[PDB]
């Protein structure tokens, strides 16, 4: 940031870019190293009523795997999912 405008002009000419608008060295635009103290929020289970753990127990809703076939007519041939939709070319910048 302390470069003279002659060196700054030579530098912007050699790079071809306005380098002072986007400097890679950091200055007073960055955050303070001392911040105010946060007040972090609580989640949805911080409630005093209607908050039984059995109604939100994720680990105890996991089941053993359903055995579809075990060795102890004109039905449709299936796939593991529908076929994948063809991706669309970018409207942003397709390079086309």
């Amino acid at each position: 940031a302390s470069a003279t405008r002659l060196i700054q002009g030579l530098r912007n000419w050699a790079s071809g870019r306005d380098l002072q608008a986007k400097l890679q060295l950091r200055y007073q635009e960055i955050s303070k190293r001392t911040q105010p103290p946060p007040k972090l929020p609580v989640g949805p289970s911080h409630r005093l009523s209607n908050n039984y753990y059995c109604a939100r127990d994720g680990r105890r809703e996991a089941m053993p795997p359903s055995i579809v076939m075990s060795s102890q007519s004109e039905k449709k041939a299936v796939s593991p999912a529908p076929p994948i939709k063809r991706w669309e070319l970018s409207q942003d910048e397709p390079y086309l």
Partner: protein, 208 residues
């Protein structure tokens, strides 16, 4: 059960169940079990004589097209007489799906190599040789891949200790790195952590 519980995907569960029935009835010669997990992952548990015919099916069939071998895995489970559980994770890019193909072997029965189906397996089952001692028949260049060159023992077997049986040091008498029996200056401290209370009643096994 909205915020903290994982949302269940019923559509994928029904579709993978239908495709598991599909594979179980196209290939009843080798398919032993078919299961779908609660988080919607299909497992085809097969006989080890059908490693090539099942994997060639899923790779080449027009309703499967599992063209990618994501991962090939063994698991040592010493309580089974076929202690090694060979796991083939497969990816169909056409149907955007994943399947798991599982089989078994013990220490002495060879599994047929799947390099003719997926070339990706060339190192993976090679690693299953190095880490578990599962021999793979008709592998092109089957040898060790991760251990040291004079390494005795298959380390990811669960009877193999955490520190090994040997440790290296440089010895200035012989001017050479040497191998000696392992002595730890501090033993690894085994922690018995398991609670004496049942955690998941849905997984309760029937008693004797």
């Amino acid at each position: 059960t909205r915020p903290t519980v994982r949302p269940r995907n019923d559509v994928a569960h029904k579709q993978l169940s239908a495709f598991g029935e599909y594979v179980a009835e196209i290939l009843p010669k080798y398919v032993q079990q078919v299961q779908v997990s609660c988080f919607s992952e299909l497992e085809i548990c097969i006989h080890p004589d059908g490693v090539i015919p099942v994997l060639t099916f899923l790779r080449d069939h027009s309703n499967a097209q599992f063209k990618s071998l994501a991962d090939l895995t063994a698991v040592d489970i010493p309580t089974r007489q076929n202690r090694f559980e060979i796991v083939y994770n497969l990816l169909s890019l056409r149907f955007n799906s994943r399947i798991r193909v599982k089989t078994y072997t013990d220490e002495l029965t060879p599994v047929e190599s799947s390099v003719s189906v997926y070339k990706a397996a060339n190192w993976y089952e090679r690693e299953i040789w190095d880490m578990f001692g599962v021999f793979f028949a008709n592998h092109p260049d089957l040898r060790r891949i991760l251990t040291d060159y004079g390494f005795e023992g298959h380390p990811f077997r669960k009877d193999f200790p955490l520190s090994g049986y040997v440790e290296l040091r440089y010895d200035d008498e012989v001017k050479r790195v040497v191998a000696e029996p392992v002595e730890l200056a501090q033993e690894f401290r085994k922690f018995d952590l398991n609670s004496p209370w049942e955690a998941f009643p849905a997984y309760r096994q029937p008693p004797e």
